[PDB]
Assembly symmetry: C11
Homo-oligomer: 69 residues x 11
């Protein structure tokens, strides 16, 4: 039942990086998206922070935001 | 528990479920032909969903479109 | 207490297909609706995704969408 | 639990409960004559409901009509 | 747990409760005469409610009328 | 738990509690005279309420009026 | 739990609590003089509240007025 | 758990807690002088609150004013 | 659990927490000077809060203003 | 669980966490330079937060501004 | 559990997590370069978040901007 974010890649090679939940913080996975693909990604037991690199249109419960490459 | 609506706008749209857990990889790909709709939840096994291909998508945060 | 989808068949032979919950994903049931019949179907312990094939008017909590045969 | 309102607009409308669980079959059909209203929940035993015949239906997602 | 409001618009209206559980049958029918109102929940014993006769009904999904 | 508000619009209005459970019968009838208000919950013992006599009624679903 | 606000519009208004349980009787009568306000919950002991006398009442369902 | 806001509009206003339980009696009377504000919850010990004297009151149901 | 916002509008404002339980008395008085904001919850130990002095107050029920002696 | 946002409008804004429990004193002070933002929850150890210095503050009840 | 969205408006923005509990200290500083977006929860380990550097911030209370150094 956690929140989720919507990431639409606006160019090739966007990275959606999950950061580890817990006392330690590191990248545990980078999912690479190509232009026009959409990832819908939850917060989870393993992921408590999500970093987006590259150009993407993003939706979350607080509205739209855009990352730039 | 949340769900995503996916409407295929062309043949071969691929809805890809990513594994929940410490590891991340795809565990299922459900292909849709033009005009079919898939309403898919997040689950004990799927904590992220990727859409490839042209599709019209509804989530609780609104509509979004994938481009194939 | 789970969410549900309303499906109204707009032609004969519409299939509402339930996909299994869990590590295994497959179709476990396909409900045939003929023109003008309505099915209101929940997500369940056994059904964690629902596929609609054929021409149908669908309502979810996200609004209306239409499937095309 | 959510519920659905079905108002029959002709005689012989059927409101059909489908079994919860790994098996899916009809377990009951409640017949409604014109102008009767049935207000029916989802339950431990009923995880999908089908309506046949002409009726005005209300759910949390709005009005829909079934036609015979 | 949710409830239904029924107002009888004529004499003889029946508000009928249907059993929760694997089996479905009527376990009670409450008769309403004209102008009487019944407010009735879903319960451990009642998972569906049928209205027969002319009445004004309100639920969470809005108004509907039986005839 | 939900409640209903009843304002008696004439003397002798009866607000009648119906028993929760397998059995359905009246366990109590509260008499209201004109201009009296009763605000009454659903409870462990009361799972349906009946109003007889002229009254103004509010519930979560809005206003309704019973007539004598 | 839900609560009701009652403002006495004249002297000697009674806000009466009816017992929760199989039995229904008055357990307490709170007298309000003109202009006093009582804000009163539903509780383990009180599952219905009756107002006698002229008062302005607010509940989650909006305003209603009891009259002498 | 809810609360009520009381602003005293003159000296000597009393905000009175009534005991939760089978018994209803006062328990505490908080004196507010003019301009003072008390923001008071419903609690394990208090299930009804009376205001005596001139005060501006806010609850989840809106504004109401007591008069001395 | 709910909280109240209090902004002091002059020096020497007191936000007083009253004890939760059968006993009612002041257990703490927090002094605020002009311009300072206190955001205080209701808690296991505080079930009523009194404000003495000129202050601008927000709660879930809206704005109210205390006036000093 | 609730949180406040604090934006420092000058150097040396002081966000002060008060200890949760029968005792009240501050257990931590986080200073912010001009333009920095702190987003801080109510927690097991903090049940009141004081802001000293010029800051722009957002909470669930709207915007408020501390002045130094 | 709540999250905040942070979009860096210049290079070298820091998103800093403060420890939950009786002890308060920084336990992690996530550097964002311009145009990158971080969506970060409150967690069992982070009960406060500080942003330093020019960034556009969304929370459930709306938009706020941090201003750089
Ligand atoms: N296996 C990952 C999948 C995931 C969810 N959200 C993510 C965000 C970024 C990267 C991976 C993910 C997890 O359960 O946490
Ligand atoms: N058996 C899968 C079915 C599923 C649900 N949502 C999905 C999204 C994509 C692919 C598969 C799925 C599950 O329970 O997780
Ligand atoms: N027996 C199935 C019935 C069902 C509910 N929703 C469905 C959607 C599609 C197909 C079947 C169903 C279940 O409980 O899961
Ligand atoms: N005994 C059935 C009654 C029922 C509830 N909703 C229904 C919908 C359709 C048909 C029967 C029902 C059950 O509890 O599940
Ligand atoms: N002793 C009754 C009181 C009651 C509550 N709501 C009612 C409606 C009608 C008649 C009595 C009541 C009970 O707890 O159920
Ligand atoms: N004893 C019944 C009373 C009841 C509640 N709602 C109803 C609707 C119709 C008939 C009876 C009822 C029950 O608790 O279930
Ligand atoms: N001791 C009573 C106090 C009370 C609350 N609400 C009331 C309404 C009317 C009369 C008394 C009360 C109780 O806990 O129930
Ligand atoms: N010790 C009292 C404090 C209190 C809260 N609300 C009140 C209203 C009126 C008087 C006292 C109170 C209690 O916890 O109940
Ligand atoms: N130690 C106190 C801190 C506090 C919270 N809210 C207050 C209101 C007024 C005075 C003190 C407080 C408590 O946990 O209760
Ligand atoms: N491992 C950290 C990750 C994190 C979440 N939100 C943060 C905010 C700032 C810094 C780190 C984080 C945690 O679970 O708490
Ligand atoms: N360790 C502190 C961190 C904190 C959260 N909110 C605060 C507000 C002010 C000062 C410190 C804090 C705690 O978890 O409580």
């Amino acid at each position: 039942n956690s929140d989720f974010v919507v990431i639409k890649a606006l160019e090739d090679g966007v990275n959606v990086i999950g950061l580890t939940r817990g006392a330690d913080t590191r990248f545990h996975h980078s999912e690479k998206l190509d232009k026009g693909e959409v990832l819908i990604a939850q917060f989870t037991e393993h992921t408590s922070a999500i970093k987006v690199r590259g150009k993407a249109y993003i939706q979350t419960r607080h509205g739209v935001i855009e990352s730039e490459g």
